[PDB]
């Protein structure tokens, strides 16, 4: 897939067929996008935020700065991300930037965008 200027992809990551990684976050002090180690970006996905290590974006999913996600697995994600405040239920893409062990997926019954634990990231 496509790595825009300023975007950095970490060791062991897999950028799937036709995936997009955008380069620079929106705004005036909009910073560069980095994807961490061992991230898996699905075919035809779009990654518009920085991701930490061991994150998964399912095929077809667009993870943009303003996309809202329903958080699942808060207790396990807290362990991988001890400074982050997992107090609420809905987060914008931009709020989740740089976190480790995230799994972005769509609930195929309800249609909701979810941010959950990458089960492999605990181990």
28, 88, 108, 123: which one contacts a second copy (CB under 8 A)? 88
The residues in 23-82 that bind a second copy, with binding defined as CB under 8 A, are 68
Tell me the CB-side half-sphere exposure of residue 21, using CA atoms within 13 A: 27
Give CA–CA dist 30/83, Å, rounded: 22
107 lies in the binding site for Cl ion (CB under 5 A) = no
Comparing CB distances to Cl ion, the nearer of 24 and 43 is 43
Give the nearer residue to Cl ion in terms of CB position, either 14 or 89.
89
Residues 89, 121: Cα–Cα separation, whole Å: 21
CB closer to a second copy, 28 vs 110: 110
Residue indicated by tokens 């976050």: 25
**Residue of 5, 29, 82, 88 interacting with Cl ion (CB under 5 A):** 88
Please state the length of the chain: 123
């Amino acid at each position: 897939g496509r790595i825009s200027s300023s975007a950095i992809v970490g060791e062991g990551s897999d950028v799937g067929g036709g995936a997009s990684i955008l380069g620079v976050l929106s705004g005036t002090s909009g910073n560069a996008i980095s994807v961490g180690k061992a991230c898996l970006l699905g075919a035809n996905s779009v990654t518009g935020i920085p991701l930490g290590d061991n994150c998964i974006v399912d095929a077809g999913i667009a993870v943009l700065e303003g996309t809202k996600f329903l958080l699942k697995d808060a207790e396990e994600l807290a362990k991988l991300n001890p400074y982050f405040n997992f107090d609420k239920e809905i987060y914008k893409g931009l709020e989740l930037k740089g976190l480790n062990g995230l799994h972005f997926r769509q609930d195929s019954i309800s249609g909701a965008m979810i941010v959950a634990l990458n089960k492999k990231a605990v181990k």
